[PDB]
Amino acid sequence: IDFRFDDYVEGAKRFDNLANLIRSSTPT
Amino acid sequence: TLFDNHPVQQYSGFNPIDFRFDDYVEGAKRFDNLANLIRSSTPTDP
Amino acid sequence: TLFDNHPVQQYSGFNPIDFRFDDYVEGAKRFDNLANLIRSSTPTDP
Amino acid sequence: FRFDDYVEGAKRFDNLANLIRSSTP
Amino acid sequence: GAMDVLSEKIWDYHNKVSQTDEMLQRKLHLRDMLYTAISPVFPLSGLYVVGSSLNGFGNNSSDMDLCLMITNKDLDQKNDAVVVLNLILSTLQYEKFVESQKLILAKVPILRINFAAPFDDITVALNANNSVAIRNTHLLCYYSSYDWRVRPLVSVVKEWAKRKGINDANKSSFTSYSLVLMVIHFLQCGPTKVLPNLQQSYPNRFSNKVDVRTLNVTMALEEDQSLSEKTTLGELLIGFLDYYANEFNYDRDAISIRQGRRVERASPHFWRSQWRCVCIEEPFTAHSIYDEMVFEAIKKAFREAHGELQHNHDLDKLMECEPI
Amino acid sequence: GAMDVLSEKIWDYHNKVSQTDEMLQRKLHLRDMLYTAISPVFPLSGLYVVGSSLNGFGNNSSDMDLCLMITNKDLDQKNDAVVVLNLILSTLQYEKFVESQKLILAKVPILRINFAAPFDDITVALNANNSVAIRNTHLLCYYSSYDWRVRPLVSVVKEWAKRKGIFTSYSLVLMVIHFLQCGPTKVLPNLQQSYPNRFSNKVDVRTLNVTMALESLSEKTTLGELLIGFLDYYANEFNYDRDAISIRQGRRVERAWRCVCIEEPFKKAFREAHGELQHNHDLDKLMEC
Amino acid sequence: GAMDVLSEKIWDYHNKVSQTDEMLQRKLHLRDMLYTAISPVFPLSGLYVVGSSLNGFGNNSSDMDLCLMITNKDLDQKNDAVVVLNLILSTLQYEKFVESQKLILAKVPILRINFAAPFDDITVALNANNSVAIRNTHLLCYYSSYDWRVRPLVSVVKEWAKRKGINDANKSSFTSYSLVLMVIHFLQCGPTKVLPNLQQSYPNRFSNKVDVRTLNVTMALEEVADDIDQSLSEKTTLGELLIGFLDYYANEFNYDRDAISIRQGRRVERAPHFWRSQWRCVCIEEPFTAHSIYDEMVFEAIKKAFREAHGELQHNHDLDKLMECEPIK
Amino acid sequence: LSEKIWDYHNKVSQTDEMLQRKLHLRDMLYTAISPVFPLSGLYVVGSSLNGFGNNSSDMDLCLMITNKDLDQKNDAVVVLNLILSTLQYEKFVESQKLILAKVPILRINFAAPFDDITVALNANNSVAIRNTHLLCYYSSYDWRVRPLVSVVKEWAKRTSYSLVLMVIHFLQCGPTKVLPNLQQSYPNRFSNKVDVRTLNVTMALEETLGELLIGFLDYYANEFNYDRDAISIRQGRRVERVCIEEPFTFEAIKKAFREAHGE
Ligand SMILES: [Mg+2]
Ligand SMILES: [Mg+2]
């Protein structure tokens, strides 16, 4: 109410997909 | 002077301090009863 | 309380301190002349 | 302040140096 | 006049300056206010009242000494405690009842606080996590409670000493806490056996291994002292002065409340040195040539006071003395 | 003894210590559990995974650094962050899956959490709204993915320093990125300078591109020459007094506290490590110091 | 209520409260007494007077801040300076003229000393080996001397702020020293250029590099080609400088974006030298080598106090009305 | 295998040449101190005279000024500052350092032909006298002590006064019993009550090397404990309060003694 919160719910779940970004640049 | 009268309020460089909190909340309240112990050893008119 | 209002006066276990004394005696006395600098730049009645 | 006389004391202490040479080997 | 008249003058004076209940309640409420300010930063801590305010020997102008307990681990006092006290300083600055703060260096770091009306007559001294003061406070409270004569005696010894300037909070090594230990030592080891050795008689209650969250604070002490004291209050003050003027040897003797006896000064506990001559062991875990002048003045002030009280039996004459 | 052997050996060491995807999945599950417990206190907050566990550079026993985001303003880390972390500590002390908690007063306060049940091998280090941890992790993850050689290189350099007493993991990673920017072989670019509005400090972190794939002499050089080169660089070329590392500018800079001065995106040991590796090409002999 | 009587009553107030020569002489005599007490323990040391008592900006009730110089090497202040101050405490306790002592943790450890009559109105703050205070005292003392309006402006700003509870030595970050830097900044960077950047114009006199035992304390400043057009400056009255000071900090300065550097001669964008934060909002660089949510309340009181002081003084030009303000809730 | 130990010992021990130089230097110090403390005595203490020193050894000195006990908190520092105030003007003195410690020290370095000798001077701290008086008899009780000590010390390099006490202890307590408890055996000679000016530095006392060293490394690698055991020299035994009580007044250092034994 008196302090200014902001919405990061979706933001934090989306940040996870960096995992895939690394995986998709590792050779097999 | 520029050293003022209080420690630096910014970060100031201290090492990290690992606190494992132990519960002392009720211990501190019970300790007040010492005061009753003093009241009880006091005679009214000796 | 147990802790008083001053550090321990007896030897507390401080680590040894190497002092190489430098001479500052006449320097601290010459610094007072800043007083003249102040007084000589004050107008007597502006 | 009471100073005490250690002049002769200090000099006689030197001859512990003999005690070891008289031992070694 | 009489030893009964002198005994009542001592008692009277005690009641005059002794910490009242109204003051104790006000300090306790102030402690509560500080705790709510501190709580968001240390949510499981507890703010104990330690020293004068609770140990039985306080007077109405005594500081409220506080001890913030945070952790059962040792907290380093050279650096870590300064960080903690500085953090608490930042928190309390926002509070409207807090007017003024300062970090001083005593035997341990100490946060001094002053307050807005209506608490501006109370000063607070806060240390970080030093549970030794809690044990100390616990022990001195049972000493103060064991015999109704202990506290009035300490009340009058304290003021006489203040009026002679050998008890002075702004000068190092001139502490009032040590005077208390000196009285306790006398009532243990002097002619009249008034106080026991509580640490030896009740190891289970005063053990340094007991967690301070479980110290007994309700139960009186179970039964030694024959209670063979038809020694008056007035005799005990005279004897106290006599013992320290004429019987205690400062260069040979040392005081141990915990051992309940005099020990040969040539011998884990910290020994204080009151006025830099009187060696006194803390219950819980070679002089400078310039010290002689002060030692001689302390010894003299005790000889004078004893001579005066032995003669006139007049408490108000004793307290009319001049400083040093 | 031979440098195609050294290259494959470095690679093999990398794959033994690297963070498995199973370990990553477990870490994300535990994060969700933490979030379920934290969400009633901060319903709009975000619990970002930051550091080694996500940026490509972590091993399996690596802490899980987390960043709780609650506000877009900047959270003061002297007072406000301690309070926010104690508000989380007050809730987690009633959760079965959480075992012990330590609050850490530091420049950036940390809530250090240990778990029970099947998660007592994972330690969490949680901060309150220190978004620079998010920016850093984002950037490093694009460095981590830019060239298949960065991570294996980083893996052995981290282990060499551990077994030789030598510097945090994060410092080393930055030493490795800098070397791959400014050494004989130009392997990595200056990403902050090449994609300036994609790694800009001024962007809301909820805007950060997390799926953009970024848009010759380097493919020559092998893993082995890279590592020998790295040790050569810090043994004989980098002045730990005259110079500092700047990542934002892919260049070394005048130092105008710590041994290697490192500016964040947002010595006889090196001598004798280079001596050994350059001469024998034996990774086992290097990390048996 | 007229710009000439505002100027003169600023000057008058300054003269009422400024440190007298008798007071300085009593302080220097007292310092000599302390040095003969300390010299058996530190025989080659020097006891410097630093800060208010010598920097030109002190009043008749300022502490005597003293700096005991012992070595050209650095002395660690966390641990080693405490040993030295405690050793000095031990030595001073045998002195009849010393009444009480106490070790304070300020930005550095500080031995606070009070005295027997006839010196019982002087308090001493003694620091161990912090030569930065000598450089600092030296630099401010030439800012103080550069222009006659500087010191009386500072006297009144200081007292106004005391009365509004904005300058208070018992409260952290509520410093008088900062206010001095704020005035010097204004006189460098406000509408009227009254002061140069002495650190840039005379880097020879004020160099961080120079041994403090060779600091020049006897020579006037040579003039510099075009750094202060000093008669355009003199068109501006004292009274108007005060009003301009209140105006600049109440309505021009952006405390979110701007910071103050006296060494550089300008405001800088908040982006080796320590930065102070006055009231935790006004970031200010020392010439020599994000906000709590609860700070915001206090910030707004500070700004308000300035806005009100500027409104009042600009309207009635009346110094005693300005000074008859009351503190901050 | 004993032989090579004695070689290293006789190679690195203090020469009689060096000791003459130290005594000369000390006499030069005393010539300068004498106007300040006319009745004082300047004793040699430590390695340089107790028989355990190298040639690189500091010369520790003790200025005796009073029969009484000198406070080391304030008086000692004032006394040492009175010497430094004088040595300031002597050409043969190169530099001085005052060391604040539990026992304040004046550390002095010298000019021209005495550059290799450093002096550490304490004020009136006479237990240093006694400790060297006693330890000079321990070094002369058996020919093996001083050579053993030599190798023990440079092994630590590749505190000295404590290395020695550990060595003396092992020769009192371990397998073979080389050295007695001197303080117990001749209680008249080494009494705490003897004035330091009438200590017996003259009369003698009334009544192998290869295996002693490897036995030492055995005694302290897997035979000695650290919080149930301490070292006492005053009483021969192993007692409990590396803890060592002087004649007069951490797993890495076990693994270090352990592998050094596999030789
Ligand atoms: Mg001042
Ligand atoms: Mg108290």
Residue numbers in the entry:
A (entry chain G): 193 to 220
B (entry chain F), C (entry chain E): 177 to 222
D (entry chain H): 195 to 219
E (entry chain B): 544 to 766, 772 to 815, 861 to 878, 883 to 921
F (entry chain C): 544 to 709, 717 to 765, 774 to 814, 868 to 877, 896 to 918
G (entry chain A): 544 to 814, 861 to 878, 883 to 922
H (entry chain D): 549 to 706, 718 to 766, 780 to 813, 871 to 878, 892 to 905
Paper text:
Cytoplasmic polyadenylation drives the translational activation of specific mRNAs in early metazoan development and is performed by distinct complexes that share the same catalytic poly(A)-polymerase subunit, GLD-2. GLD-2 (germline development defective 2) is a highly conserved cytoplasmic poly(A)-polymerase in metazoans. In Caenorhabditis elegans, GLD-2 promotes spermatogenesis when bound to GLD-3 and oogenesis when bound to RNP-8.
We determined the structure of GLD-2PAP-D–RNP-8GB at a resolution of 2.5 Å and Rfree of 24.2%. The four independent copies of the complex in the asymmetric unit are very similar (with the exception that only two have the active site occupied by a magnesium ion and a peptide originating from a crystal-packing interaction, Supplemental Fig. 1D). In the N-terminal half of RNP-8GB, residues 183–198 adopt an extended conformation as they stretch around the helical side of the catalytic domain (patch 1). RNP-8GB then continues with a five-turn helix that wedges in between the catalytic and central domain (patch 2). First, the catalytic domain is rotated toward the central domain and has a closer conformation of the active-site cleft. In other nucleotidyl-transferases, this part of the molecule contains elements that determine the nucleotide specificity (the so-called nucleotide recognition motif or NRM [Schmidt and Norbury 2010]). Both differences are likely related to a crystallization effect: The active-site cleft binds the N-terminal residues of the RNP-8GB polypeptide of a neighboring molecule in the lattice. With hindsight, residues 177–182 of RNP-8GB mimic binding of RNA and ATP and appear essential for crystallization.
